[PDB]
Amino acid sequence: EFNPYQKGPDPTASALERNGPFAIRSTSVSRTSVSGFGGGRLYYPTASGTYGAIAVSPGFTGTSSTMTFWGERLASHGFVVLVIDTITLYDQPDSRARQLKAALDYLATQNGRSSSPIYRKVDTSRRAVAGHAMGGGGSLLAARDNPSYKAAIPMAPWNTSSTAFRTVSVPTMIFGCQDDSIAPVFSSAIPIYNAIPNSTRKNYVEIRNDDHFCVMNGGGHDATLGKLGISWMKRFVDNDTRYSPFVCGAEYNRVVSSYEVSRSYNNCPY
Template identity: 50%
Template sequence: MQQHLPSGDISPRHHRVSKSRSRTVKGALAAAAATAGLLLSLIPGGAQAADNPYERGPAPTRSSIEALRGPYATSQTSVSSLSVRGFGGGTIYYPTSTADGTFGAIAVSPGFTAYQSSIAWLGPRLASQGFVVFTIDTNTTLDQPASRGDQLLAALDYLTQQSSVRSRVDASRLGVMGHSMGGGGTLEAAKDRPSLQAAIPLTGWNLDTTWPELKTPTMVIGADGDTIAPVLTHSKPFYNSLPGSLDKAYLELRGATHFTPNTSDTTIAKYSISWLKRFIDNDTRYEQFLCPLPSASLTIAEYRGNCPHTS
């Protein structure tokens, strides 16, 4: 006897075909999703990195920016004064891996009568956060701020054009730092080369205290106990003279002296890292450590700045 299926039922053969087609569609969708996921995984940071190709390293935390070392393993290479022109040689610290592409770079100058050893702690500390860092010696230890500014720029030119690590550096993303007269030189370098992305003078000294022409985002770091470059006659006038439209900050260290930047310091490191990341790497993940403005604390006597940042 012929069996009739109830009205609306689907034959077993039709049911098998439909299930087969469903599996095919689901498989195609899964393959497309997997392909999209693979493409995103090839970009550091996934979709967010596509928005900012300069972003480097994992999402920051307070502990990560205060740590003695960041997420990158580092190496270093010495540069003889005999092999360069315009400055006195130095040491380049850089992330060992090239998997993330190129990095922004910072040149750092010591102060009056000092050598690169006085600011050497900044090398591996900043490099391990995803920068190439060049701590330099000056032509003579007595060089004045204007000369130190020229030497910082000469060091950056060497770093990006001739050094053994030049392929690791993005020449469009550069910054300068310096201690004492090297800090004064940092301001000079930023004035002479407006394309610099960040400047950080550390207890800076310069007879020129007005810098309305600067176009480089600048964080001025002073010390409340500085008797060599007192904040009232150096760091505060530096900061106050910067144009109002500029991304800028003033950090005054509490219980600190002119020579505090010569030894490893967590407060200097955490805010320098945040400033350099924010403006050299355009990494807005670090904005949280700069805005809202940090409050006075056991290590901060005063902090001023403009928030939110515009660039």
């Protein structure tokens, strides 16, 4: 099927386990130069063309410096990625959802500014969210409230009641940390997964024998979580069905049946 959003080589496991084939630059977004979020860190490919836009939120008392992995790893596979700082360290999930929307609106603005390093670099119609803990809840609430979004990746989601997510229509991949002692997977992440309609493309992958920061910088799951996140963004932000096997096929089965993973659920195939 013709796909104008397809970029980069045919994917193989080893390639998706490391920084991608797009050379990237990063720049700081000053809190003072934006409204509706606390600024953050911008990653973009230096090669020409338009790329999907992704906004990533930290959790409670979290800063963008703790998620630079996701900025670099996603951008280097061919996305424009803004890891936000929030207005306050203490912003709740609903607030983080509004800030993720403003962050994506910010990218759409900068796309039309001749001065911006991402001038003419953003496909403003192809937007996704992701986040850690209350940022994960926030990404899923932003997906609920903005059903034009292409993908959400909540990671170790925290407080928000599962009942909030019974109408989510955005393709959602959730990461769990099996021994999360802040947001226990069986009471926080898995009920959220289960609440999403079975008509929505979804996936849950849980990291074995690890706690709440297993998805964050220094978490020690770059190869697996990076591969799954790149693959989910590629599949849904870019409509790139070459990535299906990494979320539903042979390469997914090898990962979820490995010693690194304690659970997976999905409504594959897709």
